Design a protein around this ligand. Structure first.
Ligand SMILES: Nc1ncnc2c1ncn2[C@@H]1O[C@H](COP(=O)(O)OP(=O)(O)NP(=O)(O)O)[C@@H](O)[C@H]1O
Ligand SMILES: Nc1ncnc2c1ncn2[C@@H]1O[C@H](COP(=O)(O)OP(=O)(O)NP(=O)(O)O)[C@@H](O)[C@H]1O
Ligand SMILES: [Mg+2]
Ligand SMILES: [Mg+2]
Lengths: 491, 507
């Protein structure tokens, strides 16, 4: 009825790196490779090489809408792909190398990826599944060199190409979740979604990302695009430190101090191992100020450990389906007067719903449950970076949403008058161990319950195909969980 | 189109207030009214009353796309209108009461405003222009009571109504710029533009707005929606302190200390009056940490004075056409090792282009000028909250754009290798005095009816007219527009500007 005079300028992920190259071109991107060697590059060079990757991928037959898959850890070549693939209007499919060969083959075949980029230390896995892949036309090793039948990344680079412009709602990337019963389910992100997510999650009450920050994502670049951190860090022009596959405490500490890391993010298991190490050696990190924990619930103790060592811990919550961040923990101004015990309890809560997210905790018919911090309901979400369904799966799509169009997370929670959310349970019958999913059912038909664990956070226990980490440690369900609550003895 | 699975949810300004009510509902909104009295409300109450305002305006015949105008200063009722009008799918036209009666009547008629909300102290102005208005059906006084022929705001409130959602690219508000030749030109903002602006401008390297902040916008709610600060403050759930028309230093200090203000934003003239006050009294602000100066260039000495008191000063730049923020000043990490003097100089620069803004300093063909901090060119912009033209004016629209689609600001600048912009000059021939525009041409062409009017640096105001009185007042000019001094086919102005550079003693 009344048009605005505003320009119809589309949101695009390439604009982050373009701005980084122009304003913060000398800012460093530091990578530790699988061999332990440390590689140094900058935003200016990443931008140049990302343009070369766009031209190289075009020469390999990649066009707008085509899927280019990755199987790799956090390093500069993965960051170059993060921009080049969406930059040419293609779809960045981050695949998880920790999954079974059968699961990876299914996901790559379902997405119909045209090109696969993968780390050299993952060649045995690629050689193992290669014969099962039906769409992959080119296999690119993310390294200087590649063996027979394989193409090296440095060889695959072509002439510099200009980025391709698309409507912001077009696909930029995709990822499959294994936190579900049956087959993996695909979620397709858009430029619009990930740009908005990068902005809204990086505010002061969120990750508070600044140009002066040095950012180390411990979360894998195959876990919801490392929680969108590589994009958000580029947007502000922060120095990035990409740790690679080595996530042992001594390796991380070396990077924390050596590179002057100020901000980091990862799953609870990595931080528990890090805290164990810092406490045993009496070593205190010389620059680290902020740490976010996500993927699973952070134990109250984990927060108390780091706060004692001078590290601020902020819980984050989300799903593959939500890009991922929908909830972030910070202490409200008027709640700073709470006692140290009360404040620790508050920090141990999941947190507050972030900007541009409509969150509710509701029952079976979509009715919100009372805000008393006691009543249980399902977390339900609506927003521009929240999925409205799945790719190529009609039954998963129609069971994903409520009648009034809210996405159903499958997580049971409470919420209070202050607006704080607390994940308490899960509708979905699954085990999450060290930030990776195990299906109870698949182990059964071959009763399996999730039992709390100190180090990881849940471990399979059976009652009387698969990888060694999936194996149940020891040999109506709301009873066996409460009965064997302390089998693995974890607080 | 390999389809994304992401929800097709629109960006809407109402979402800021709905979130504020749900999560930060007890956070305060404090206003000083025109009488000096202090009013106290909360986000929850503002939310509830804004729903009543939507219901009330609907009963008055306001529909989707209709324009609702305001003529008022910073207070809770203006904030309620900031959300209710866009929340019902209508268009909030923030009008400037400092303009001439002829200018205000023109913009209200041009925008075809249906309802006018105004401050009680601006009643004489509204009464003076009422006969000139052709579209305004309802006149609402933003107060508890109203005289005959006028509706009181509290009376105008109706039943609580649910918000209406419009396409994000549709209009949420509009404002007219007087920083142009001829009649004022209208800029129409979208929900999408202002939501994105609020997000991108509020990052750590920007205003760094937080729930813990106490925000005091000295910038008027008719100056590009108070630089979008009432929206961004609501977004983060910060406490808001709205000073009203009383912007004198004593009145502000009471609010700075009494309410625990952490963040503030305004024009250099207001901050110069504050610095003079604090220095002359020896009074020190107890809570103020951050101060942004915009609208005009912040003098190097102004920044030093506040930094000497522990207040961080960050320059911001924009236009009515740009929502307004496109450039913000902050010191890059690797330049923190610069000396005190060098850092103060860097802070005096306009700053760095902010996220989602494509900025260039370009020549006449649209080619970027060298990044040596010497070569002059025009600041040209592209982005989702930058205007692509003007409302109901084709000529002005086509003259505001380059062939490749960049908006022409009319600002002459230099830029360096670090990306820092410095505004040096203006193509447009106007005077900006205390944040308000004076047309040199309108002053010249009037005078010659019986001349060359140029902008000269001023200590207090930022520029004052010098002509190279009664006749000018009769042609429709106010006291503040009159040139301070007179000294006895276009005009070669650069020479007169350089010759009389220090005429109004002090650059
Ligand atoms: N902060 C948290 N507290 C409690 N549970 C969490 C938290 N964050 C995530 N979860 C759980 O983890 C689930 C999301 O897992 P998932 O979709 O696999 O994302 P991810 O762990 O970040 N890795 P990815 O699968 O690549 O997206 C949620 O549904 C929650 O059950
Ligand atoms: N930080 C700054 N430094 C130098 N000049 C500035 C700065 N900010 C604004 N300007 C000038 O002011 C012009 C914008 O004026 P204008 O469109 O009136 O915005 P505004 O004064 O902030 N809001 P409003 O008074 O409602 O129009 C720009 O074109 C610049 O010439
Ligand atoms: Mg999931
Ligand atoms: Mg203007």
């Amino acid at each position: 009825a009344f048009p605005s005079t505003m320009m119809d300028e589309e949101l695009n992920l390439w604009d982050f790196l373009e701005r980084a190259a122009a304003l913060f071109g000398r800012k460093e991107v530091v990578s530790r490779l699988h061999t332990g060697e440390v590689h140094r590059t900058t935003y200016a060079e990443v931008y140049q090489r990302a343009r070369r990757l766009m031209g190289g991928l075009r020469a390999l037959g990649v066009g707008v809408g085509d899927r280019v898959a990755t199987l790799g850890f956090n390093h500069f070549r993965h960051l170059e792909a993060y921009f080049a693939v969406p930059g040419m209007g293609a779809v960045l499919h981050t695949a998880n190398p920790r999954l079974s060969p059968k699961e990876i083959a299914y996901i790559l075949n379902h997405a119909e990826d045209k090109v696969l980029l993968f780390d050299p230390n993952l060649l045995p896995l690629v050689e193992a599944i290669r014969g099962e892949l039906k769409t992959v036309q080119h296999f690119v090793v993310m390294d200087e060199k590649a063996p027979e039948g394989y193409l090296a990344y440095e060889e695959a680079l072509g002439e510099e190409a200009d980025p391709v412009r698309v409507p912001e709602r077009a696909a930029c990337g995709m990822a499959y979740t294994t936190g579900t019963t049956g087959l993996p389910k695909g979620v397709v992100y858009s430029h619009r979604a990930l740009v908005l997510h990068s902005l809204a999650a990086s505010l002061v009450d969120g990750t508070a990302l600044s140009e002066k920050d040095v950012v180390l994502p411990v979360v894998p670049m195959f876990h919801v695009n490392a929680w969108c951190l590589p994009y958000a860090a580029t947007l502000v022009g922060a120095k990035q430190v990409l740790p690679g596959p080595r996530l042992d405490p001594a390796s991380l500490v070396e990077l924390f101090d050596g590179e002057g890391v100020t901000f980091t993010a990862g799953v609870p298991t990595v931080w528990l191992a890090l805290a164990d190490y810092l406490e045993s050696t009496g070593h205190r990190l010389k620059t680290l100020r902020r740490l976010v924990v996500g993927g699973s619930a952070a134990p109250r103790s984990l927060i108390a450990r780091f706060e004692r060592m001078g590290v601020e811990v902020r819980q984050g919550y989300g799903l593959t389906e939500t890009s991922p961040v929908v909830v972030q923990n910070f202490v409200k101004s008027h709640l700073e007067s709470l006692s140290e015990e009360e404040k620790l309890t508050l920090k141990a809560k999941t947190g507050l719903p972030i900007p541009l997210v409509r969150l509710r905790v509701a029952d079976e018919e979509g009715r919100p449950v009372p805000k008393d911090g006691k009543a249980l309901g399902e977390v339900q979400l609506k927003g521009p970076w929240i999925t409205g369904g799945y790719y190529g799966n009609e039954e998963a799509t129609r069971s994903a949403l409520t009648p009034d169009g809210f996405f159903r997370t499958g997580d049971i929670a409470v919420w209070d008058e202050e607006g704080y959310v607390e994940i308490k349970d899960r509708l979905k019958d699954l085990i999450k161990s060290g930030g990776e999913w195990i299906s109870s059912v698949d182990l059964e038909n071959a009763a399996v319950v999730a039992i709390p664990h100190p180090k990881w956070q849940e471990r399979p226990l059976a009652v009387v195909g698969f990888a060694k980490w999936q194996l149940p440690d020891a040999y109506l369900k709301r009873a066996l969980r409460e009965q064997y609550k302390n089998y693995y003895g974890g607080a």
